[model samples]
Target: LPEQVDWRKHGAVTDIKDQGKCGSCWSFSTTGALEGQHFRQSGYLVSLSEQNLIDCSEQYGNNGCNGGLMDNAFKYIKDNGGIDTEQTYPYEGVDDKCRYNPKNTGAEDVGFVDIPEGDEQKLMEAVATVGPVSVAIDASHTSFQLYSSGVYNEEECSSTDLDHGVLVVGYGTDEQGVDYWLVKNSWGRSWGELGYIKMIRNKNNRCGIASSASYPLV
Candidate 1:
């Protein structure tokens, strides 16, 4: 991997979002990755709609306000033509009926590329080439729930039981020279380095951050 890489510095990373109490982390992750790629491609940082995925993507086996997956959400977006803008379909933080209006969609993906499962080096390569990547991790642990700052390395966090979805915006090392993956979360700006987290990197893919990584191809 390079010495460091950050989409935030490139102005591709969008503002941090909040999923509230809903289990809609997958939608946010999907939008974050899409927003970055869309910005990189079109030179416009458009905030796509996560609410559209939350409500309209049930056909893809995703439950609104419950939980979902990035790959399935991407499939739904492609099949449904595209995704709407946040200005048109604002987040409600709750399960809502499908109100997707494709005409107002601000973004669409041709397809997506998945990183090789369980391969950290491949994931690093993907992040460097791709704008941002959507990843699923085991965020059910208490340590993750109250995470604030510093390089998070919870050994108790399982790699297999991936529960929460997040965006890997970049990668670098800390002041102490610890390698880390700069992750963006949907927990708002009040949590974890302004709604972001530095996850321990090059440690056998801790918490499976590289297990379910993928990015949209705009």
Candidate 2:
């Protein structure tokens, strides 16, 4: 295994996507992980539609704009044959009745796995071995909202009660020798480090990144 890992450099991680004003962050997380897996498996990078999950995954226990879970989303796609592409379905960033097009299917997941809760080692291994991972985190804190550059180590960010779901694309030590997790957010490209964040890593599971993490199979 290498000392560091970055899925973006390997053509697995797709470009940054915005979730807009909706609470469909989990959908983005689900698609992000699947997008990476799809690239790794087929050697083709196709951006899947988060809106497809936001609209069609409710039957699988997701609440659309109210919220959702990556595990449930994965199961939904597995049973639904596959997920749709961003080019066909597109994203509205708003809740709408399910209007899925069967022909627009993009990627299909065989299955998925939830990492051991609160275990940083398991999460690190997942990111390195697997592609990008879907992670639920406490992104409600002001420190996280105003985050830009540098390692974000907010004390108030919770280890439980995670309010937002994002993708852990990679991890490595910073220029100052600070270990950090490179995460991708759906709040838009202008919101973070071009829609990314360097969160403190190996620091008590900083921001509960390892509390709930998972990724889909090819």
Candidate 3:
């Protein structure tokens, strides 16, 4: 695998977005992976709809604003034909009714693959070879909430308490030769390093990054 990779630097990631007060984070991660795959295939960065998944994916085992799993969300999109664009569906940050339009889909994912549980090498290779990957991490701690910059390994968090969904854009090292995973959060631009966080990489899978990581297949 390459030493470092950043899908955001390659025009695969979209602008930073805020999920508001709703717990529809799973949708953002789901859309992010699809967006990257779509951009890789078409060379155009189009934002997918999170609200579409939040509201329509409930039957697939998602709880809408109450929180959900990315795996379930991905299945919903694939089984439903495709996902709508943000411009077509838009995010309301609410547990509103479903407004999915099959004819207006802007992105599609035929299937997805999950990194082997706790396999760091596979995770790194996926991010480097595949596009951005959707990951579930323990973001319940204040450190993740207040993270501003720098490698975020504050001796905090648990690998089993995966509470939030994010996108792993890539991985790289700091000036001190410390490796880190470049993560993109859904908490908007004001949070973390401008909607991004560098988590210590190749360690004990800090923050459960590889415990529940996966991505869409083009």
Candidate 4:
């Protein structure tokens, strides 16, 4: 992927991050999508508060440490209030007390766009022009803290029982003519090539990057 285009051209900040302990993948993915979208739209790559979704997006079944759906998080933003940048609300990685703005501007709405079923090509094509695409990947076989090469196997990717949320940034063929996707993980840089993963691409439906959402930057 690095050979296809400058990673920095469509690159996103992997510096600030959080861990989805249980099934709180929705909050993590929501924050990541919004963060990347904000960068694309505003160019001020700042980390947004996932804790907002964890703490506030509860009505939509967004339990703090427990797991939830990404669309539910989006629904919470649409009904209650939009999410704020981490600069405004900061992330403690856990649901906690924080000053929340209750100014129902109606400026806080997140909507989901339906991508056709089994349309991984369309998704990746859009990614080539858009930026990082929000996705749910099987991170079951993933072990090493610093993952760079030879980190995945189809059997492992298929057998893994845990589903995780990640961002697909770029893609290209590896040295052996094997296609791969450059993904950004929420784990800190100490893990996996500065918190990144190179997974086999064009397999298992864009690694199961199901739905897409465009969050409000205001």
Q: TM-scores of the models, in the given order?
A: 0.97, 0.97, 0.97, 0.78
The number of clashing residue pairs in each candidate reads 0, 0, 0, 6
Worst 10 residues of 4 by lDDT: 209-218
Per-residue CA lDDT of model 4 for 141-214, tens digit only, reads 53533366553434544322436767667677777887677676777666676677777666664345433422
Per-residue lDDT for 2-73 in model 2, tens only?
Answer: 568888999988889888888899999999999999998888999998889988888899998899999999
Query: Model 1, range 59-136, lDDT digits (tens) per residue?
Result: 899998988899898899888889999999999998888999978988898889999888878888888887789999
For candidate 2, report its TM-score: 0.97
Model 2 scores a C-alpha lDDT of 0.90
Give me the displacement of residue 103 in model 4, in angstroms: 7.5
- Residue 128 displacement in candidate 3 (angstroms): 0.7
- lDDT for 164 (candidate 2): 92
| lDDT (Cα, 0-100) at 46 in candidate 1 | 91
Q: List ranges where model 1 is wrong by over 4 Å.
A: none
Candidate 3: count the clashes: 0
